[PDB]
Design a protein around this ligand. Structure first.
Ligand SMILES: O=C(Nc1ccnc(NC(=O)C2CC2)c1)c1c(Cl)cccc1Cl
Length: 288
């Protein structure tokens, strides 16, 4: 599928992804303003060959994914400037849970439904042999009060069939506060590492993405802000000691224990996304 840049009318900027900026455009070939609203992700023109090969990998990944809880790929646009492809995706109207939750008080049952849907989309992703590596409330988009979709595949990687993990690089942009200890210490990302990040995302939802309760805020309160190059080492050490993010206010005790089970230090003790689906369905039913 191909979109022409001459019909793309920029409305506003939506934010910054991993490889570049996301903008909202009206794709209007008739010029009558009745065209579809689309989210367009672009690679910064100044980016090097490392970001360029990774950007092409992200497009390749999103083009192959098709799920009700995964942002819909619409096509690509020939960017004459930057000499690359612009990723055309569906506009998800309510935006990210990070932006939405602080301004709209959502009930516990609805948050658990969002958690269930995240697990459904993540179970499909893992079945396709991919790891997400950036599962956070910031990357979860809300279509309506009852539908959520996973976004930003900028860190997503293919896991070979014979392998259970992918070896990661020492990176400044890594979302360390959403990462399992095996990622921080051994630079290995397992399917089970995405489950750890889900536990963190669930914590975020239960706090209504309150910035004063965010994973960086809480972990840095424990680590301190004057630790030289040792923030990650101190994070690794507290996690190994069994320290964890606290129970969000009004989060049921059993839901917090499910969260802590996503945060097992031993990756094999964590549930898979497939195990989480029937559990979250039952928990959502109890609270609805
Ligand atoms: O792709 C993103 N956001 C989208 C996509 C589609 N539609 C929307 N919709 C809106 O932003 C609505 C609120 C105006 C946002 C996005 C950005 Cl910009 C930064 C980090 C992570 C992610 Cl996933």
């Amino acid at each position: 599928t191909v979109f022409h840049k001459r019909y793309l009318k920029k409305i506003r900027d939506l934010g910054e992804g991993h490889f570049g900026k996301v903008s909202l455009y009206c794709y209007d070939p008739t010029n009558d303003g009745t065209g579809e609203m689309v989210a367009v992700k672009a690679l910064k023109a100044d980016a090097g060959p490392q970001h360029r090969s990774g950007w092409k990998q992200e497009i390749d990944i999103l083009r192959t994914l098709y799920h009700e809880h995964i942002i819909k790929y619409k096509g690509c646009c020939e960017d004459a400037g930057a000499a690359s492809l612009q990723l055309v995706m569906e506009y998800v109207p309510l935006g990210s849970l990070r932006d939405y939750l602080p301004r709209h008080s959502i009930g516990l049952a609805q948050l658990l439904l969002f958690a269930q849907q995240i697990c459904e989309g993540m179970a499909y992703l893992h079945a396709q042999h991919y790891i997400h590596r950036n599962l956070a409330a910031r990357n979860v988009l809300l279509d309506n009060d009852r539908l959520v979709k996973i976004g930003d595949f900028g860190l997503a990687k293919a896991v070979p069939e014979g392998h259970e993990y992918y070896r990661v690089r020492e990176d400044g942009d890594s979302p360390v506060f959403w990462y399992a200890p095996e990622c921080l210490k051994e630079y290995k990302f397992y399917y089970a590492s995405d489950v750890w990040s889900f536990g963190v995302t669930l914590y975020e939802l239960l706090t209504h993405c309150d910035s004063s309760q965010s994973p960086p805020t809480k972990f840095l309160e424990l680590i301190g802000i004057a630790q030289g190059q040792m923030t990650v080492l101190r994070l690794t050490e507290l996690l190994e000691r069994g320290e964890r993010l606290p129970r969000p206010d009004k989060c049921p005790a059993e839901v917090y224990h499910l969260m802590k089970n996503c945060w097992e230090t031993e990756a094999s003790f964590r549930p898979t996304f497939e195990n989480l689906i029937p559990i979250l369905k039952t928990v959502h039913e109890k609270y609805r």
